Amino acid sequence: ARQENPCGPCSERRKHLFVQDPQTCKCSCKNTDSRCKARQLELNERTCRCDKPRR
Numbered sequence: 001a002r003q004e005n006p007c008g009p010c011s012e013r014r015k016h017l018f019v020q021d022p023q024t025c026k027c028s029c030k031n032t033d034s035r036c037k038a039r040q041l042e043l044n045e046r047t048c049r050c051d052k053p054r055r
Contacts (some may be wrong), residue, residue, distance in 0.1 A: 003022060005023075005025065006025075007020060007022075007025030007047040008025065008043060010026075010027035011027070013038065014047055014048070015027075016022035017029060017030050017031070017047070017049075018030065018048060020040075027047060029048030030048060031043055031048055031049070031050070035050070036051075040052070040055065
């Protein structure tokens with residue numbers, strides 16, 4: 001009535017961290033690389049979390 005556009009699940013368990021659009025039904029992590037880099041970290045697109053590459 002207002003839209004009607006079913007979207008397929010993105011993640012599995014830790015899906016709350018993602019954001020889904022009603023037009024493309026795609027997902028994008030909430031946290032950004034900038035935030036992770038703020039403490040020498042790198043946002044991973046698998047779980048949307050910060051990780052330490054080396055330094």
